[PDB]
RNA sequence: AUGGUGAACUAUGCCUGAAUAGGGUGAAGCCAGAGGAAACUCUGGUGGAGGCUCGUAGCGGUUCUGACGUGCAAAUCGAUC
RNA sequence: UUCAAAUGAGAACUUUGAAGACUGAAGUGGGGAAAGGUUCCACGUCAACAGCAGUUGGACGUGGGUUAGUCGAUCCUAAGAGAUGGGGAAGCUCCGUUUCAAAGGCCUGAUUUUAUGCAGGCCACCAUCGAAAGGGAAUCCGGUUAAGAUUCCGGAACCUGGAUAUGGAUUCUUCACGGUAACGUAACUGAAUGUGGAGACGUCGGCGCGAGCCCUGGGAGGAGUUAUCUUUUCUUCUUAACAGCUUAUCACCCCGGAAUUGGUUUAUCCGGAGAUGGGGUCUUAUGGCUGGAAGAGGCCAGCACCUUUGCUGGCUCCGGUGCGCUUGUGACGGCCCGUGAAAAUCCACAGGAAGGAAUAGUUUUCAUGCCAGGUCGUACUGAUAACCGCAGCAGGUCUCCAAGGUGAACAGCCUCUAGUUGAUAGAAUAAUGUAGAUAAGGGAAGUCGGCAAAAUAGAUCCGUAACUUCGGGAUAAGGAUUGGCUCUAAGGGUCGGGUACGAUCAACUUAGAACUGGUACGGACAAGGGGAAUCUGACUGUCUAAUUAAAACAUAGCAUUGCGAUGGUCAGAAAGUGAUGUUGACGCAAU
């Protein structure tokens, strides 16, 4: 029973702050609250709690991550070119 | 005396009502009342066999 | 602070070195459904805690009372 | 006239750090024999929020090579490092996210964090959530290594300056609208007493060089000389230009 | 103030003791020149400032 | 209808000033002060309440028989049994695969 | 001008404590249903979001330019806010 | 407010009885923090004082009164404060707090000239002050005083330190057995060193359970009303710390190997990293039964007497209910660029130095036994009279406990318990007033201005415009309806059923229908006026205590500046000085 036409989680803020700041906030909220896959046991149980800290519901591994998302574009591109450079020094 | 006349359904009219229907008895309370009873009618029929476990499980998420 | 129910163990308290006092109590009490009976509690006063031994049956209770060491100082009721 | 606000801040009264809750102070291992002739293993035993900080810290415990017991460090957690991970710190350590290696031992383009300005200063450069330096080459006599700092600046430091491979966790933090006063309120609540900010232009002349006048206005050029004296520097200090930065920046 | 220091209870004590009228026999002394207790004090007239 | 009073001079609702109302042999209501609740000791490896171990406030533990402070198996009342299994297995295998690494690089040093 | 005393009021930060009837609203998440070739759209529930709202205590102090104005009071009292 | 009595030279004002009221458990009730300092209590008592009085008092005079191993302090650390080798400063002093320092004390062995010299290893921890709301060893009930009580009395406990023996346990397999396991237990040696836990921690939400309170049936008592009516109205029927056994949501173990996926919360989570199922293990919050303990306390009846005051009997029993109320707790869920102290102190484990038996050893973390617990505070007020405001000032000043009805309700209004009935008094009722109200017909013509005042108001149903950041605007606007009494229907729990139902027990909610009245019904109390625009600030928030609350300040948002630590900005007389900085450009500083 589609509850709100477009303000999603951001509907708590009412009419305040102006559409555009809500638009922005809504994006990262949707990001930060949502449940992610665990690169360790496979169960989509990683949830946030304080920026950059991602922990696993069961299995209890805790990863450092983005302020509002688990992996951040930048970090992963760094992971990849760390691979790259390391490959150079066993090959 | 009064409390009797109450529980005989009296002085309960729109002119003796002052808090909202909601406040008098919460919507939610009703839901939990009702839903817990469906949920547990279900359980006895399964734990007995009047219902088969598959039919139960549809009724559960159906209730 | 304590309840006892081994009648043998009990007697060994009454003859335990530091035990100076001891008191018998008698309670009118009722049995099961109908009538009443006469319950009796044997309280030995230890240095550190008060042991007490219920004996419902008066029959046991009677004999038990002579058994009481003839140097122990018993308060009756 | 009154002592203006930016002067007052310096005597640290109501103005010092709010520091009761902080996790300790993050730094790298002491530059001992192990870390500088080889490598030495630790485990990240937990990563944790540091109060009034952007990025998470990672408690990383090590063996004590000199007497039997454990010694634990407090690190700034690079992204991706996780509890239970083993951490390798040394010259002859290997090139994975989370380890810590002298800028000498990593190829150009490597991406490190918490890097030392001088060797064993236990870490100075790039620590804020998201930041990092990149090695952009090294001249192997007088073993320097040139890096590019998060500012754009390019410094050359010793090759034995340590750094930890990867980027600091918690990036993106600033992308999200604070939205209300309150959020910022609570933000500075765990930093210092710098918020809110009254505009000098709304004060009286006692109070500021911007104060007074029958309309609110700065009254003279607000770019102030480097040579200005205490009480004079409020505005755009030493500003070498001013106005809306048209056009792409990005240090050439 | 309801759960006091010894030092304060004691000033306190001493001050109860100085609260008496002139002992009337002083009046009879040769040359006696004191009529009443001039330094008398009352709890709701003058506070002890500790 | 019967109200009640604190029993200590402290008038505030602090953690260490909890009350419980209670009916006496006199037939009246009297306050009582309730000590903070104890909490369960926790496993060092994983961090859960470890079973078998009695839950007292810390000094009360020195007034209590040693059996209340452990379970039998190694790392008794200190790690959580499951977590001991973990480190037995791991111990075994790594001491074993340590032998493997040895005769293999002795083989490397042998022929190469 | 010189040398002294004040943060028991009040301003601001820190530490450690405590306190706030009853209502209105119904945000994410979730469950069951409906339509449609398809993409997709829709309904009834559940849930309990907010520097949200009605309003006590609380904190404030709008108006009467009310009382008082040699006062109860060197700032109070009433009503309304 | 009133009548009478009693006392007294004297009574509107003191005491007692009666009466009429009030506060109405968010108290005018019962206690405390700060502050006071004897105001507490008894006797005496009225010159001043209590803006009339006075026989009365928080006044005067004279005495009495504050009892702790467990309640606080005392210990610990917090922001902070501050000695010390030092470094500045003419100097009063300023800086630094582990700092550029040759910083100090413990376990026992060696002594068997003796008491502590040296024989090992450690430990390099680096003053001290700072919380009567944070942390924290341990006490409860009954009774008792003119005035003290978790402090005295009675009874029953517990903690810490010190001593120690007796019993048990243990051992010829020396340093315990049992259970597949989770784990069991009355015990069951354990140095240095290491390590883990506890102390120790946000806030809101619904859900679950405890306690006390509230409601209520039966019975056993006492009281009240009884022209009439009421198997009635009111009230007593209680059980502390502590101790034994038992009791748990969570968690965990064994068996087992799951799609037709199952289990499952109010709230969608969980399962091949082993679900559902069956069987077990654990924490003991909490509750039960018993010990404490009926001997106490509570309620009556029946004799006794100036007296102390007794004596003697009984009875003190069994239940029911829940979106109840306050609190407490749990397993969960929401929120954060906020993720919500420290230290003392206690335990455990890893380790295995050492020491220890069969002719007799080991053991005090098992039981029972002996001793000791210092110092200071403890009275009362806590406020329209014990504190601060010149004062017994309508101001100010931190907190816990919290009954019945109406009703959404800790609102208003009425009441039980408790407490008050204090505020100069009498006679009249002109003007003018201050506070409370009403007014025909008109309806803002009043006035700078609708200032004041009036209107509106709860709930149920119906109905709802522009515009919009799509969240709103919205209780938009506009409407009807609402009492009593008498029925009807709907919505639940508990059981047994070979491997369709029947039986009982207990709850106000919602809707519908009759009848009924001078058309009244949110009947007092309670409770929004609405609409169309212009100016202006986005919003919530802020300020001139005591003439300005605004359009002023703040804010998120936008944009500019400085800075890579040998630094930016800022502090200082100086400095081996300081703020930012437990910091590092997703940063700090300045507009
Ligand atoms: Mg709902
Ligand atoms: Mg319910
Ligand atoms: Mg049910
Ligand atoms: Mg399902
Ligand atoms: Mg100046
Ligand atoms: Mg500081
Ligand atoms: Mg500020
Ligand atoms: Mg600004
Ligand atoms: Mg700004
Ligand atoms: Mg500003
Ligand atoms: Mg101004
Ligand atoms: Mg200028
Ligand atoms: Mg100037
Ligand atoms: Mg100006
Ligand atoms: Mg301007
Ligand atoms: Mg005074
Ligand atoms: Mg004075
Ligand atoms: Mg009652
Ligand atoms: Mg007290
Ligand atoms: Mg055990
Ligand atoms: Mg146990
Ligand atoms: Mg102050
Ligand atoms: Mg609290
Ligand atoms: Mg509320
Ligand atoms: Mg309402
Ligand atoms: Mg509210
Ligand atoms: Mg279809
Ligand atoms: Mg709500
Ligand atoms: Mg609000
Ligand atoms: Mg409001
Ligand atoms: Mg209301
Ligand atoms: Mg305010
Ligand atoms: Mg006013
Ligand atoms: Mg006026
Ligand atoms: Mg006048
Ligand atoms: Mg108001
Ligand atoms: Mg009078
Ligand atoms: Mg009344
Ligand atoms: Mg009230
Ligand atoms: Mg009064
Ligand atoms: Mg008192
Ligand atoms: Mg006083
Ligand atoms: Mg008196
Ligand atoms: Mg007189
Ligand atoms: Mg007087
Ligand atoms: Mg007078
Ligand atoms: Mg007179
Ligand atoms: Mg006197
Ligand atoms: Mg006296
Ligand atoms: Mg104590
Ligand atoms: Mg002491
Ligand atoms: Mg100093
Ligand atoms: Mg101290
Ligand atoms: Mg303390
Ligand atoms: Mg305390
Ligand atoms: Mg008593
Ligand atoms: Mg006495
Ligand atoms: Mg008293
Ligand atoms: Mg005693
Ligand atoms: Mg005794
Ligand atoms: Mg002892
Ligand atoms: Mg045994
Ligand atoms: Mg420790
Ligand atoms: Mg710990
Ligand atoms: Mg705390
Ligand atoms: Mg106790
Ligand atoms: Mg089971
Ligand atoms: Mg089994
Ligand atoms: Mg409360
Ligand atoms: Mg948390
Ligand atoms: Mg422990
Ligand atoms: Mg040795
Ligand atoms: Mg012992
Ligand atoms: Mg007292
Ligand atoms: Mg008084
Ligand atoms: Mg006053
Ligand atoms: Mg009173
Ligand atoms: Mg008067
Ligand atoms: Mg008069
Ligand atoms: Mg008229
Ligand atoms: Mg008209
Ligand atoms: Mg008109
Ligand atoms: Mg005119
Ligand atoms: Mg006109
Ligand atoms: Mg005008
Ligand atoms: Mg005009
Ligand atoms: Mg008006
Ligand atoms: Mg009218
Ligand atoms: Mg409108
Ligand atoms: Mg009708
Ligand atoms: Mg029915
Ligand atoms: Mg205009
Ligand atoms: Mg505004
Ligand atoms: Mg003003
Ligand atoms: Mg002024
Ligand atoms: Mg205003
Ligand atoms: Mg004003
Ligand atoms: Mg703009
Ligand atoms: Mg120097
Ligand atoms: Zn996982």
Swiss-Prot record, chain B:
Name listed for the protein in its UniProt record: Large ribosomal subunit protein eL19A
Further comment: Present with 97700 molecules/cell in log phase SD medium.
Sites of Phosphoserine modification: 27
Family: Belongs to the eukaryotic ribosomal protein eL19 family.
Region of interest called Disordered, as start-end residue ranges on this chain: 1-21
Cellular compartment(s): Cytoplasm
Function text: Component of the ribosome, a large ribonucleoprotein complex responsible for the synthesis of proteins in the cell. The small ribosomal subunit (SSU) binds messenger RNAs (mRNAs) and translates the encoded message by selecting cognate aminoacyl-transfer RNA (tRNA) molecules. The large subunit (LSU) contains the ribosomal catalytic site termed the peptidyl transferase center (PTC), which catalyzes the formation of peptide bonds, thereby polymerizing the amino acids delivered by tRNAs into a polypeptide chain.
Highest taxon of source: Eukaryota
Subunit: Component of the large ribosomal subunit (LSU). Mature yeast ribosomes consist of a small (40S) and a large (60S) subunit. The 40S small subunit contains 1 molecule of ribosomal RNA (18S rRNA) and 33 different proteins (encoded by 57 genes). The large 60S subunit contains 3 rRNA molecules (25S, 5.8S and 5S rRNA) and 46 different proteins (encoded by 81 genes). eL19 lies in close proximity to the binding site for eukaryotic initiation factor eIF4G.
Residues of the full protein shown: 65 to 127 of 189
Swiss-Prot record, chain C:
Keywords recorded for this protein, A-Z: Cytoplasm, Ribonucleoprotein, Ribosomal protein
Keyword Mitochondrion: no
Subcellular location(s) of the protein: Cytoplasm
Pfam families, sorted: Ribosomal_L38e (PF01781)
InterPro entries in UniProt: Ribosomal_eL38, Ribosomal_eL38_sf
Biological process, per Gene Ontology: cytoplasmic translation; protein-RNA complex assembly
Cellular component terms (Gene Ontology): cytoplasm; cytosol; cytosolic large ribosomal subunit
Superkingdom classification of source: Eukaryota
One of the record's GO molecular function terms: structural constituent of ribosome
Keyword Transmembrane: no
Further facts: Present with 50200 molecules/cell in log phase SD medium.
Subunit structure, as described in the record: Component of the large ribosomal subunit (LSU). Mature yeast ribosomes consist of a small (40S) and a large (60S) subunit. The 40S small subunit contains 1 molecule of ribosomal RNA (18S rRNA) and 33 different proteins (encoded by 57 genes). The large 60S subunit contains 3 rRNA molecules (25S, 5.8S and 5S rRNA) and 46 different proteins (encoded by 81 genes).
Functional summary from the UniProt entry: Component of the ribosome, a large ribonucleoprotein complex responsible for the synthesis of proteins in the cell. The small ribosomal subunit (SSU) binds messenger RNAs (mRNAs) and translates the encoded message by selecting cognate aminoacyl-transfer RNA (tRNA) molecules. The large subunit (LSU) contains the ribosomal catalytic site termed the peptidyl transferase center (PTC), which catalyzes the formation of peptide bonds, thereby polymerizing the amino acids delivered by tRNAs into a polypeptide chain.
UniProt protein name: Large ribosomal subunit protein eL38
Gene designation per UniProt: RPL38
UniProtKB/Swiss-Prot annotation, chain D:
Record keywords, A-Z: Cytoplasm, Isopeptide bond, Phosphoprotein, Ribonucleoprotein, Ribosomal protein, RNA-binding, rRNA-binding, Ubl conjugation
Pfam families attached to this UniProt entry: Ribosomal_L2 (PF00181), Ribosomal_L2_C (PF03947)
Cross-link Glycyl lysine isopeptide (Lys-Gly) (interchain with G-Cter in ubiquitin), sequence positions: 45, 92, 118, 144
Subcellular localization(s) per the UniProt record: Cytoplasm
Source organism, top-level taxon: Eukaryota
UniProt-listed GO biological process terms: cytoplasmic translation; maintenance of translational fidelity; ribosomal large subunit biogenesis
InterPro entries to which the protein is assigned, alphabetical: NA-bd_OB-fold, Rib_uL2_dom2, Ribosomal_uL2, Ribosomal_uL2_C, Ribosomal_uL2_CS, Ribosomal_uL2_dom3, Ribosomal_uL2_RNA-bd_dom, Translation_prot_SH3-like_sf
Modified residues (Phosphoserine): 51, 94, 158-159, 248
GO cellular component, one term: cytosolic large ribosomal subunit
UniProt GO MF annotations: RNA binding; rRNA binding; structural constituent of ribosome
Protein family per UniProt: Belongs to the universal ribosomal protein uL2 family.
PANTHER family per the UniProt record, alphabetical: LARGE RIBOSOMAL SUBUNIT PROTEIN UL2, RIBOSOMAL PROTEIN L2
Role of this protein: Component of the ribosome, a large ribonucleoprotein complex responsible for the synthesis of proteins in the cell. The small ribosomal subunit (SSU) binds messenger RNAs (mRNAs) and translates the encoded message by selecting cognate aminoacyl-transfer RNA (tRNA) molecules. The large subunit (LSU) contains the ribosomal catalytic site termed the peptidyl transferase center (PTC), which catalyzes the formation of peptide bonds, thereby polymerizing the amino acids delivered by tRNAs into a polypeptide chain.
Note: There are 2 genes for uL2 in yeast.
The encoding gene: RPL2A
Swiss-Prot record, chain E:
CC terms in the record's Gene Ontology section: cytoplasm; cytosol; cytosolic large ribosomal subunit
MF terms in GO: structural constituent of ribosome
Subcellular location: Cytoplasm
InterPro entries reported in the protein's UniProt record: Ribosomal_eL39, Ribosomal_eL39_CS, Ribosomal_eL39_dom_sf
Keyword presence, Ribonucleoprotein: yes
Domain of life: Eukaryota
UniProtKB keywords: Cytoplasm, Ribonucleoprotein, Ribosomal protein
A biological process from GO: cytoplasmic translation
Family statement drawn from the similarity comment of this UniProt entry: Belongs to the eukaryotic ribosomal protein eL39 family.
Listed name of the protein: Large ribosomal subunit protein eL39
Biological source species: Saccharomyces cerevisiae (strain ATCC 204508 / S288c)
Name of the gene this protein is made from: RPL39
């Amino acid at each position: 029973a589609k509850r709100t036409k477009k303000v999603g989680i951001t509907g708590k803020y009412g009419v305040r702050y102006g559409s555009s700041l809500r638009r922005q906030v809504k994006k990262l909220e949707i990001q930060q609250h949502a449940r992610y896959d665990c690169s360790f046991c496979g169960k989509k149980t990683v949830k946030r709690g304080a920026a950059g800290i991602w922990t696993c519901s069961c299995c209890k591994k805790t990863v450092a991550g983005g302020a509002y998302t688990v992996s951040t574009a930048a970090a992963a591109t760094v992971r990849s070119t760390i691979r790259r450079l390391r490959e150079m020094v066993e090959a | 005396a009064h409390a009797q006349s109450k529980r005989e359904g009296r002085h309960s009219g729109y002119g003796k009502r002052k808090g909202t229907r909601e406040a008098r008895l919460p919507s939610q309370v009703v839901w939990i009342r009702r839903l817990r009873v469906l949920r547990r009618l279900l359980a006895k029929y399964r734990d007995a066999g009047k219902i088969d476990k598959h039919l139960y499980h549809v009724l559960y998420k159906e209730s | 602070a304590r309840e006892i129910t081994d009648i043998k163990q009990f007697l060994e308290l009454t003859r335990r070195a530091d035990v100076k006092t001891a008191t018998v109590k008698i309670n009118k009490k009722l049995n099961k459904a109908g009538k009443p009976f006469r319950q009796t509690k044997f309280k030995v006063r230890g240095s550190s805690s008060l042991y007490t031994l219920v004996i419902n049956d008066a029959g046991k209770a009677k004999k038990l009372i002579q058994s009481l060491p003839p140097t122990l100082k018993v308060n009756r009721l | 006239g009154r002592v203006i606000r930016n002067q007052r801040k310096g005597a640290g009264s109501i103005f010092t750090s709010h520091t009761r809750l902080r996790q300790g102070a993050a730094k790298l291992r002491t530059l001992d024999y192990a870390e500088r002739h080889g490598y030495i293993r630790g485990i990240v035993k937990q990563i944790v929020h540091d109060s009034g900080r952007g990025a998470p810290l990672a408690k990383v415990v090590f063996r004590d090579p000199y007497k039997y017991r454990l010694r634990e460090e407090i690190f700034i957690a690079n992204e991706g490092v996780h509890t239970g991970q083993f951490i390798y710190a040394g010259k002859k350590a290997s090139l994975n996210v989370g380890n810590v290696l002298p800028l000498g031992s990593v190829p150009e383009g490597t991406i490190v964090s918490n890097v030392e300005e001088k060797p064993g200063d236990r870490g100075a450069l790039a620590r804020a959530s998201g930041n990092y330096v990149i090695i952009i080459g090294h001249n192997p006599d007088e073993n320097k290594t040139r890096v590019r700092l998060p500012s754009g600046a390019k410094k050359v430091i010793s090759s034995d300056a340590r750094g930890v491979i990867g980027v600091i966790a918690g990036g993106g933090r600033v992308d999200k609208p604070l939205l209300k006063a309150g959020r910022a309120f609570h933000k500075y609540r765990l930093k210092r007493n710098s918020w809110p900010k009254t505009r000098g232009v709304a004060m009286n002349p006692v109070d500021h060089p911007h104060g007074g006048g029958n309309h609110q206005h700065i009254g003279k050029a607000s770019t102030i000389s480097r040579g200005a004296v205490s009480g004079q520097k409020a505005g755009l200090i030493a500003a070498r230009r001013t106005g809306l930065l048209r056009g792409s920046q990005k240090t050439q | 103030a309801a759960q006091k220091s010894f030092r304060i209870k004691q000033k306190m004590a001493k001050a109860k003791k100085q609260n008496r009228p002139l002992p009337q026999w002083i009046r009879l002394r040769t040359n006696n020149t004191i009529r009443y207790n001039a330094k008398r004090r009352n709890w709701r007239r003058t506070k002890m400032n500790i | 209808a019967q109200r009640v009073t604190f029993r200590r001079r402290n008038p505030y609702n602090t953690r260490s000033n909890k009350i419980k109302v209670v009916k006496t042999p006199g037939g009246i209501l009297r306050a009582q002060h309730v000590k903070k609740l104890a909490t369960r000791p926790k496993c060092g490896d994983c961090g859960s309440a470890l079973q078998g171990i009695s839950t007292l406030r810390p000094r009360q533990y020195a007034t209590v028989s040693k059996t209340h402070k452990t379970v039998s198996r190694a790392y008794g009342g200190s790690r959580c049994a499951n977590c001991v299994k973990e480190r037995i297995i791991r111990a075994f295998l790594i001491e074993e695969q340590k032998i493997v690494k040895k005769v293999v690089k002795e083989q490397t040093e042998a022929a190469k």
